C-alpha cells in the first residue's frame, strides 16, 4: 500500500528532480572486505516488493572471479525518514556462481524472479568460459521455498545460435503469466549485413570507410561469423512449472554492438534500454507495444551520453564510428507514456573521479539537472526506478562507486522525488 506503480502526470509544464538525494541504507547487504568488489547490480520494483542482485567478485571488478551472486527480495516502505526506505525480506545466494555468465532480476506481485545464463561445465565441475549451457530461473516468494527451474535445450528457442549468453543486468519485467528480459552475447552469422551507423559530421576517406568500421564494431575480434548481438527473451508457461524461453535477436542493421540492457513497463506498452558497449555513446532506448524487434521505435533524444569507461576517442557532438569498447551503464526512467519526459543520472570524468548529476529531460529537450553525490570519489553506473509514494512520484537510484579513492567498489542506493511545475 505504501507504493504504487507510477502514474504519469496529466505556460509550460516541466518536471525536475527534487532538491535532495536521500540515502536508502541497507537496500542490500555488503561486507567491508577490501579484497571484494561489489558490482553489476540489478534492481527491479514491482507493486510493492523490490528485487535486487549484485555480483561479489575477488579483487577485479571486471574479470575477477564471481565469489557470490547475492539476491534480496524486499519491500519499499516508510520508516519515518525524509524519503522512502528499504526492508529486506529474503537474502539468498545463487547456487554455483562460478558457472554463471550473468543474472538479472524482475519484481512481481509479492514475488520476484532471478534469470541466469550459465556456461558449460567440465567434468571437474569447473566452468568452460565463454560458453552457453542454457538458463536457470528462480522464483522467490516470502514464506515459500525458492523454486528453481532448469531451462536447457528442450525448453528454449533462439532465432540464432548463441555461443555465449549474458542476461542484461538492467533487469526484466513480469506481465501476466510471462517474464521479459534482455540478453546479449556471441551469435553465429553466415550472411552479409549492413550494421547501423548513425553519426554526425565525420571526415571520410572513400565514403564507405565508416560503414566498414560499423560492421567490424559488431564482430567478435574481427570475425564476420561471430557477432555480438542483443535479443529479447520471453519466459513462457510460468504457471505450468516448466517455463519455456523464446529469444529474438536485433539484427545489426537495427542495433549497435550487443550490451547490457533492461526491460520496462510503460503504461500499456514496453521499453528497452541498451547500454553503450561500442562507439555510439548516445542514449539507446526503444519503445514497443508488443516486445518485438519490428515494433521497437528508438527515442531521438541523446541524453545521457556515456562519457566514462570508454576507450573511444570520438566526440560527443559527432560520435564518429571507430573500434572501441564502452563498459558503463546509465539507464533512464520514463516519466510519460511516450518517454519524452524521463529522469536519469549523468556522470562526467574528473581525472580518476567523477562529477555526477541527476536530471529530468522534458519533452521539449530542456534538461533540469542537479549536482549529486559530491561526497563520493567516483560513481560509475546508475539504474533508476520510480513509483508513487506519499502522493508524489519518487525514484530510487542504484549506483556503483567508491566513496573514497582507495575504497573498494560498492553499491549505493538513494532516493529523490520528481517535481511537477508550470512556468
Ligand atoms: Cl558484412
Ligand atoms: Cl502455463
Ligand atoms: Cl549526459
Author numbering: 175 to 184, 193 to 605
Reproduce text from the manuscript describing this model:
Analysis of the MojV genome reveals that the paramyxovirus is closely related to viruses within the genus Henipavirus, an emergent zoonotic group of bat-borne pathogens distributed throughout Asia, Australia, Central America and Africa. Although MojV-G displays a six-bladed β-propeller fold characteristic to paramyxoviral attachment glycoproteins, our analyses also show that MojV-G is antigenically, structurally and functionally distinct from all other characterized paramyxoviruses.
Following deglycosylation with endoglycosidase F1 (EndoF1), MojV-G was crystallized and the structure was determined to 1.94 Å resolution. The β-propeller fold is stabilized by seven disulfide bonds, all of which are conserved among HNVs. Two nearly identical molecules of MojV-G were observed in the asymmetric unit (0.33 Å root-mean-square (RMS) deviation over 412 aligned Cα atoms), although crystallographic contacts were not consistent with the formation of higher-order MojV-G oligomers, such as those observed in HeV-G18 or other paramyxoviruses. However, a portion of the crystallized N-terminal stalk region was clearly visible (residues 175–193) and folds underneath the sixth blade of the β-propeller domain in a conformation analogous to that observed in full-length Newcastle disease virus (NDV) HN glycoprotein and parainfluenza 5 HN (PIV5-HN) glycoprotein ectodomain structures. Unlike other paramyxovirus attachment glycoproteins, which are glycosylated throughout the β-propeller18192021222324353637383940414243444546, the ectodomain of MojV-G encodes only four N-linked glycosylation sequons, all of which are located outside the β-propeller domain.
